[PDB]
Amino acid sequence: ICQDVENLQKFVKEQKQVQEEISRMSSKAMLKVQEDIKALKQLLSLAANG
Amino acid sequence: ENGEKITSLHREVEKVKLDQKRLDQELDFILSQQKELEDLLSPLEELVKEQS
């Protein structure tokens, strides 16, 4: 049994690491995009009006 | 949501390039009307120093 808790907390925690891992990983790259396509669309309107 | 815009961006972009091409080669040709209609206003410099 107390082999036991040595492992389970270990597999659980191993998992929290991945949770951290995702947490480390987070977006600005994404936020960037809408701004750009919103911007490119506008230049296209230029060229078109030109 | 952004991808879609991207789409009608692609769209309407290559129809802008259908545009310009066209207007491009157009300008050649309005341009060529200007080299011909010119050589030959004269060679209309014969026909008019002859009359002279």
UniProtKB/Swiss-Prot annotation, chain A:
Listed transmembrane segments: none
Coiled-coil region list: 6-26
Signal peptide: none
Top-level taxon of the source organism: Eukaryota
Subcellular locations according to the entry: Nucleus, Nuclear pore complex; Nucleus membrane
Post-translational modifications reported in the UniProt record: O-glycosylated.
Additional record remark: In rat, the p62 complex contains two different isoforms of NUP58. Isoform p45 has however not been isolated in human so far.
Purpose of the protein: Component of the nuclear pore complex, a complex required for the trafficking across the nuclear membrane.
Family, as annotated: Belongs to the NUP58 family.
Assembly notes: Component of the p62 complex, a complex at least composed of NUP62, NUP54, and NUP58. Interacts with NUTF2. Interacts with SRP1-alpha and Importin p97 proteins when they are together, but not with SRP1-alpha protein alone.
Domain free text: Contains FG repeats. FG repeats are interaction sites for karyopherins (importins, exportins) and form probably an affinity gradient, guiding the transport proteins unidirectionally with their cargo through the NPC. FG repeat regions are highly flexible and lack ordered secondary structure. The overall conservation of FG repeats regarding exact sequence, spacing, and repeat unit length is limited.
Protein name, UniProt field: Nucleoporin p58/p45
Species: Homo sapiens (Human)
Gene: NUP58
Swiss-Prot record, chain B:
UniProt modified residues of type Phosphoserine: S42, S52
Transmembrane segments: none
Glycosylation sites: T7
Disease: Infantile striatonigral degeneration: Neurological disorder characterized by symmetrical degeneration of the caudate nucleus, putamen, and occasionally the globus pallidus, with little involvement of the rest of the brain. The clinical features include developmental regression, choreoathetosis, dystonia, spasticity, dysphagia, failure to thrive, nystagmus, optic atrophy, and intellectual disability.
Free-text note on domains in this protein's UniProt record: Contains FG repeats.
Known role: Essential component of the nuclear pore complex. The N-terminal is probably involved in nucleocytoplasmic transport. The C-terminal is involved in protein-protein interaction probably via coiled-coil formation, promotes its association with centrosomes and may function in anchorage of p62 to the pore complex. Plays a role in mitotic cell cycle progression by regulating centrosome segregation, centriole maturation and spindle orientation. It might be involved in protein recruitment to the centrosome after nuclear breakdown.
The name this protein goes by in its record: Nuclear pore glycoprotein p62
Lineage per the UniProt record: Eukaryota, Metazoa, Chordata, Craniata, Vertebrata
Whole-protein coverage range: 367 to 418 of 522
